[model samples]
Target: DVLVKWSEDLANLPSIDTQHKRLVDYINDLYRAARRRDMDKAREVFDALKNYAVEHFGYEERLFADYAYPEATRHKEIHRRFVETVLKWEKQLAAGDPEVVMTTLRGLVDWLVNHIMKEDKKYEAYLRERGVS
Candidate 1:
């Protein structure tokens, strides 16, 4: 039921908001495929989601680089980890383990909330403080 339309607001950064919504939708699709017990479809969505997420993450990561955001390295580490985690799940899915679908989906949900609040929020406050829209 947690669609891409519903997201945890990290700190209201417009830059993050748009990409995040797309990612959320992809994750939700992954979840739906699992709920339906469709491994093939789940694998397909997972592949799309992984590629899109990497693309989106790179775009957002650029902001920190462009602004020379103070916590840039620290923030990017989380991104790196998240991307690695996704890739790992992709490997698991390739093994044809149906259970990985549900587990990966849940992990995405949990990580999304925490990453936004803990890491993403840091840069949001920085931008806001600097009067960046």
Candidate 2:
């Protein structure tokens, strides 16, 4: 079903975790639409995801700046690259490529899970130490 369940291990700061869950929900919605071959629904959810992602990333970047996070530059770069990739996928979806749908779904799932577990984890302790919990 390509449904991703949120676990405690994925939890970061409360606000960040909430944003992550919303992103995951969007991906799950895309998976459902893709599985049913509903390209229209898929495109709708993808656009929502893209928009939310920009907002979420900006939130994170603001926190990074406020906290003086050492990895802020690199982290922002990763966010930028991911958005660029999603933009490319948006075009592929517009082309109505069925194959690209599944590929994009898998990519989204992998990228989000890994980014939270690995990349975001790096800032958890740092932020917590700064009383950002």
Candidate 3:
């Protein structure tokens, strides 16, 4: 599903918010590609989304280190697992699994909402408390 609405829960953090919106763009592209049976387009969208997620995670990693965020290790592990899952789906898709598309769609949407609203917000709150504007 294309995420046309950006929830208030996603808007309060700047870099994370911006990257999440960018992720939605990639997810929309992915959804369209899958719906159209365009394998090449699907792969392209997947790669783009993967790259963007890497960079997004990088931003958070730097922040966690810079601020000495308490949950840094756990957060990095979460990011690592997510990227690994996507890479796993990439292999599945390569093995003729079209269901990978649905898997990715579900993962992206659920992760974007839940991670941002729950996990990332905690980071934002920590930053705010520390005066790390």
Q: Identify the superior model by lDDT, candidate 1 or candidate 2.
A: 2
List where candidate 2 sits over 4 angstroms from the true fold.
none
lDDT (Cα, tens digit) per residue for candidate 2, span 1-133: 5589888889899989889999989988988888888888889999999999999999999999999999999999999999999899899899975567888878888898999999999999999999997
Candidate 3 displacement at residue 62 in angstroms: 0.0
Estimate, for each residue in 27-75, the C-alpha lDDT of model 1 and write its tens digit: 8888788888899999999999889878877876777777789888887
Please, what is the whole-model Cα lDDT of each candidate in the order they appear?
0.78, 0.91, 0.79
lDDT, candidate 1, residue 8? 53
TM-score ranking of the models: 2, 3, 1
Determine the C-alpha RMSD for candidate 2 after optimal superposition of all C-alphas.
Answer: 1.3
Where is model 3 poorest over a 10-residue stretch in terms of lDDT?
A: 91-100
Error of 2 at 129 (Å): 1.5
lDDT assessment of candidate 2: 0.91
Give the TM-score of each candidate.
0.85, 0.94, 0.86
The deviation in Å at residue 84 for candidate 1 is 1.5
User: Which portions of model 3 show Cα errors greater than 4 Å?
Assistant: 1-4, 97-99, 131-133
- Maximum-TM-score candidate: 2
lDDT of 2 at 15: 82
